[PDB]
Amino acid sequence: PIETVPVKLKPGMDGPKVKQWPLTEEKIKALVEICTEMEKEGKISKIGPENPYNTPVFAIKKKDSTKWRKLVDFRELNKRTQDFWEVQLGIPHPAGLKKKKSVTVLDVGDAYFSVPLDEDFRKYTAFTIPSINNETPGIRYQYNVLPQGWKGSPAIFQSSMTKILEPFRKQNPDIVIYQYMDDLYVGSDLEIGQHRTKIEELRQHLLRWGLTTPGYELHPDKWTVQPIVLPEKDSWTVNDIQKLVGKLNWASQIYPGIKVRQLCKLLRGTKALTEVIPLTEEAELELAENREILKEPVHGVYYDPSKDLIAEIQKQGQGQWTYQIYQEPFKNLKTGKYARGAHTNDVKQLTEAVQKITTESIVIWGKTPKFKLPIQKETWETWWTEYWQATWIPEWEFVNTPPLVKLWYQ
Amino acid sequence: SPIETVPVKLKPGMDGPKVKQWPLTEEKIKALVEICTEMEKEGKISKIGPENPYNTPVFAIKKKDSTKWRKLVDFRELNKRTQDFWEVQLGIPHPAGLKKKKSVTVLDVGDAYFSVPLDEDFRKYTAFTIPSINNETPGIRYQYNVLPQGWKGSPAIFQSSMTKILEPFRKQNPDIVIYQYMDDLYVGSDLEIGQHRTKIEELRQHLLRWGLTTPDKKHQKEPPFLWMGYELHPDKWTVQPIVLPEKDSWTVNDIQKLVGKLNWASQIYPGIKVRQLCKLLRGTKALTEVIPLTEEAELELAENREILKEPVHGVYYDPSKDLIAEIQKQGQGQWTYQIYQEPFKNLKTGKYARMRGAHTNDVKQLTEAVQKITTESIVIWGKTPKFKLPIQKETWETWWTEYWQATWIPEWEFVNTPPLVKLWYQLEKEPIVGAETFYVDAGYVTNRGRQKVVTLTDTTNQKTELQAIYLALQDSGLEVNIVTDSQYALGIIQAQPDQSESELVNQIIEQLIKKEKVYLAWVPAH
Numbered sequence: 003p004i005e006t007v008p009v010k011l012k013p014g015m016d017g018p019k020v021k022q023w024p025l026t027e028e029k030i031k032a033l034v035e036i037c038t039e040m041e042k043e044g045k046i047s048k049i050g051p052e053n054p055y056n057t058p059v060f061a062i063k064k065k066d067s068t069k070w071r072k073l074v075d076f077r078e079l080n081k082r083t084q085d086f087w088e089v090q091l092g093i094p095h096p097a098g099l100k101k102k103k104s105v106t107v108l109d110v111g112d113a114y115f116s117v118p119l120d121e122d123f124r125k126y127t128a129f130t131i132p133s134i135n136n137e138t139p140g141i142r143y144q145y146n147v148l149p150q151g152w153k154g155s156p157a158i159f160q161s162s163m164t165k166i167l168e169p170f171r172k173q174n175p176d177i178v179i180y181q182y183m184d185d186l187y188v189g190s191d192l193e194i195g196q197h198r199t200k201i202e203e204l205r206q207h208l209l210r211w212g213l214t215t216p217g218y219e220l221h222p223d224k225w226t227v228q229p230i231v232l233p234e235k236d237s238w239t240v241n242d243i244q245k246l247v248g249k250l251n252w253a254s255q256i257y258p259g260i261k262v263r264q265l266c267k268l269l270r271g272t273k274a275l276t277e278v279i280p281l282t283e284e285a286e287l288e289l290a291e292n293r294e295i296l297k298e299p300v301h302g303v304y305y306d307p308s309k310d311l312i313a314e315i316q317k318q319g320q321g322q323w324t325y326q327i328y329q330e331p332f333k334n335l336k337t338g339k340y341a342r343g344a345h346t347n348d349v350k351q352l353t354e355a356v357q358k359i360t361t362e363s364i365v366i367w368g369k370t371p372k373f374k375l376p377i378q379k380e381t382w383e384t385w386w387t388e389y390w391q392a393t394w395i396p397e398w399e400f401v402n403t404p405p406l407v408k409l410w411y412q
Numbered sequence: 413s414p415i416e417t418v419p420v421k422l423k424p425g426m427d428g429p430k431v432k433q434w435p436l437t438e439e440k441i442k443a444l445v446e447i448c449t450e451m452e453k454e455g456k457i458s459k460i461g462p463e464n465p466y467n468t469p470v471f472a473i474k475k476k477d478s479t480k481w482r483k484l485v486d487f488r489e490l491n492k493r494t495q496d497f498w499e500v501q502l503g504i505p506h507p508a509g510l511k512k513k514k515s516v517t518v519l520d521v522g523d524a525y526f527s528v529p530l531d532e533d534f535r536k537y538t539a540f541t542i543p544s545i546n547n548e549t550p551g552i553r554y555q556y557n558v559l560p561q562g563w564k565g566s567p568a569i570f571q572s573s574m575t576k577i578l579e580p581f582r583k584q585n586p587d588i589v590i591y592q593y594m595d596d597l598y599v600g601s602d603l604e605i606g607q608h609r610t611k612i613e614e615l616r617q618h619l620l621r622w623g624l625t626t627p628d629k630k631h632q633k634e635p636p637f638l639w640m641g642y643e644l645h646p647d648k649w650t651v652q653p654i655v656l657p658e659k660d661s662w663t664v665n666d667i668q669k670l671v672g673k674l675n676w677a678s679q680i681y682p683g684i685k686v687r688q689l690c691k692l693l694r695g696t697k698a699l700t701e702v703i704p705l706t707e708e709a710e711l712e713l714a715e716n717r718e719i720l721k722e723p724v725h726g727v728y729y730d731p732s733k734d735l736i737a738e739i740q741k742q743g744q745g746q747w748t749y750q751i752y753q754e755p756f757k758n759l760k761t762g763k764y765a766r767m768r769g770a771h772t773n774d775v776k777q778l779t780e781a782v783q784k785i786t787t788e789s790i791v792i793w794g795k796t797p798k799f800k801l802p803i804q805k806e807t808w809e810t811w812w813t814e815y816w817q818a819t820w821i822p823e824w825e826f827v828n829t830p831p832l833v834k835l836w837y838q839l840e841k842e843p844i845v846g847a848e849t850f851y852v853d854a855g856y857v858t859n860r861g862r863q864k865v866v867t868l869t870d871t872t873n874q875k876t877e878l879q880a881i882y883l884a885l886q887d888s889g890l891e892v893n894i895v896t897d898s899q900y901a902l903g904i905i906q907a908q909p910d911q912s913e914s915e916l917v918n919q920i921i922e923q924l925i926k927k928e929k930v931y932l933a934w935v936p937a938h
């Protein structure tokens with residue numbers, strides 16, 4: 003077939019050998035029908051016991067679709083694949099995309115199967131359909147074409163893409179199209195009705211060039227930060243003011259101009275928690291000043307492409323959550339809130355929150371963040387695929403949320 | 413066999429073995445030659461030539477019913493140099509996951525490794541020398557051509573090759589179930605005897621079509637099969653019988669092995685207990701130290717002997733049925749569960765006592781228990797069980813609302829089998845009007861003038877933060893307002909434990925349950 007661009011692992015590194023987390027029967031079935039079809043077209047090939055590598059695989063469902071989708075967790079392989087610089091553009095980031103009234107996201111993962119994979123590389127793509135109760139050691143395959151979800155993928159298809167995206171890029175240069183992994187982001191400010199059709203075009207304009215394309219329809223322009231909040235009471239008690247002094251002194255870690263001296267003086271003495279303190283003139287003013295400082299994100303905090311994007315989520319209750327994206331502790335680039343009344347279930351709301359914060363980190367910085375999840379691994383590992391719809395998998399860690407750090411956000 | 417070879421390579425960055433053969437007694441040398449000649453004559457091995465610098469040492473030793481020796485080859489060195497392979501079957505099937513058969517046979521696959529071809533470009537490293545005893549005489553050089561015993565890749569190439577051979581037969585015969593485990597072959601079906609025995613001989617044919625040897629009827633083994641600590645019948649399974657000896661003197665070692673067996677037995681024996689037997693282990697100075705059976709260790713040991721008297725077995729899986737899982741509280745921090753599809757017809761049983769964390773409550777613990785079982789269900793049956801829990805929806809809901817961690821548990825129905833899990837106490841959401849306010853630091857002072865100080869040196873900084881709270885709890889009335897600066901204490905009480913491995917904590921929890929209303933608040937330190 004056509005000619006392969008030679009791929010290599012960072013010098014010194016070996017292929018990934020990751021364990022497949024157990025899958026339910028319905029899931030292995032889905033994957034078995036999918037892989038047989040791919041096997042017949044020649045995209046994947048059965049392998050022997052002499053390949054010791056493994057990447058985990060999952061079957062995730064679609065929105066308004068009865069179709070399953072195979073999902074490969076290439077995270078370990080992607081960290082071990084040669085650094086990718088493309089001798090064409092280096093595919094930078096459209097700082098402008100974020101300012102767009104509308105952004106549509108297209109899956110172009112399929113473009114990838116029309117291109118062969120360096121032969122010596124194939125072995126590293128080894129994956130396993132596990133068998134129930136360990137009856138067998140599983141059905142082993144490797145890829146012959148560009149796998150969806152690998153980093154070298156869009157790198158290698160990088161040229162045929164611009165070639166397909168030429169009539170369009172100039173037949174209407176008011177459109178910003180960014181490509182991240184297997185996704186395509188089309189942005190503009192057109193009126194919602196005309197935008198929706200200019201996408202229909204692109205779709206059609208693509209099939210006829212060497213690919214097919216099927217999700218989200220976001221609006222970055224009305225996305226905002228949730229600043230720190232101060233309660234506004236009719237009458238204050240000792241408890242109220244103690245909570246206030248506590249929140250306030252955590253906050254002064256970020257905004258140093260925060261004073262609590264007067265507040266603190268209204269609170270010296272073993273007074274009863276429910277004693278109502280009528281406010282002093284100086285304390286009223288010190289509060290007024292503090293609110294003012296908290297009205298905007300702290301000054302001079304900057305996105306450094308050299309550092310990792312970290313995302314922390316907190317369970318607020320009643321189907322509510324709060325998150326913060328930062329690179330340095332306190333130095334927050336963004337903060338936000340997520341709600342779905344409380345009902346569906348924790349794991350679902352959390353998975354949906356993760357997909358949304360990732361989409362936004364991409365649209366804004368063109369990078370996915372590393373999450374700190376408030377859940378036990380075994381529960382997450384068991385259910386996340388039940389709700390996942392994205393085609394990438396960000397990295398995550400599992401943590402313990404402090405009760406204070408939690409309420410200091412709402 | 414006329415099968416395709418699997419390509420093998422040595423670990424990168426190294427060469428093959430170049431090991432010195434050990435001087436061989438002329439007699440054991442004579443034997444190596446009778447073994448090796450018959451083999452070159454079977455094409456298993458073949459004579460090579462000089463400056464093929466590769467060499468692995470051999471020798472001989474015999475066993476049962478013969479005056480002929482067994483050849484051994486020391487591959488530890490080639491093994492070191494050889495690449496790794498995909499985990500020769502990693503996982504072990506749990507009996508409870510099988511569907512019942514009507515007839516089952518186990519074919520023994522002999523010298524099969526010798527029936528599979530070794531990659532041609534690797535036989536070169538499997539060279540070894542057979543020394544002839546005369547002075548300036550031979551010293552015959554050989555290399556392997558089939559799969560050598562005890563070589564790193566043999567277990568995996570064979571299995572793979574076998575899987576390939578058995579394929580058309582499985583396609584042609586979808587009724588029959590074949591499970592490959594090392595050298596053995598369990599072949600079972602739902603055919604009537606005569607029919608079943610015929611297929612077996614059809615199979616033995618197919619395997620001979622590629623040179624494989626198996627034993628016919630009289631030399632075959634019959635159920636039960638004792639496999640991996642289990643006992644397997646066509647229609648039921650069980651754990652290999654457990655022996656509970658009678659003795660007066662029990663060493664530490666004795667008790668460990670006995671706790672060992674009791675745990676293994678609990679996968680089908682509902683009710684096994686080892687809490688008392690385990691306590692015997694406390695502070696032991698030697699494996700040979702004998703420990704006196706506490707009066708409670710005796711009872712436990714005795715009740716255990718009872719359960720094991722009666723022999724239970726597990727039923728197999730019926731895919732056409734739902735999986736029900738049931739959990740009960742068997743003591744503090746002890747849970748038991750049974751997995752069945754038909755009331756009282758257990759596929760599997762188990763205990764859970766994971767102390768995840770230093771402090772917990774029953775709701776968090778039931779939740780973790782439900783997680784384990786779930787993962788376990790998925791691995792054995794590919795699906796999750798529908799649970800029956802002794803906790804009301806409203807108790808469950810009420811706690812995971814106020815807990816900061818996300819969690820989620822599948823479909824469950826409330827089962828009224830006491831003891832029922834309940835929340836022992838609830839800290840207030842807002843301060844209490846007119847309840848005294850204790851300000852803690854070990855000591856305290858209240859808005860009513862009250863005061864107290866205490867001195868403790870045998871402490872940690874955390875323990876004192878908790879001491880003070882206890883004191884406040886101790887001296888207060890039925891409704892209290894407590895204020896602390898300690899982030900630690902708040903974290904602990906705030907999570908609402910009902911058990912801990914901390915004495916102090918268990919005393920506080922007690923105060924906590926007696927009180928009417930309690931509000932705990934935090935403020936920064938200085």
Ligand SMILES: CC(=O)c1ccc(C)cc1N[C@H](C(N)=O)c1c(Cl)cccc1Cl
Nearest residue numbers: 137505510589590591598599600639646
């Ligand atoms: C996964 C499997 O089928 C299996 C694993 C281990 C053993 C000892 C026998 C196995 N299968 C055998 C079999 N192949 O007939 C078996 C079944 Cl299917 C049901 C009841 C008893 C027996 Cl022995």
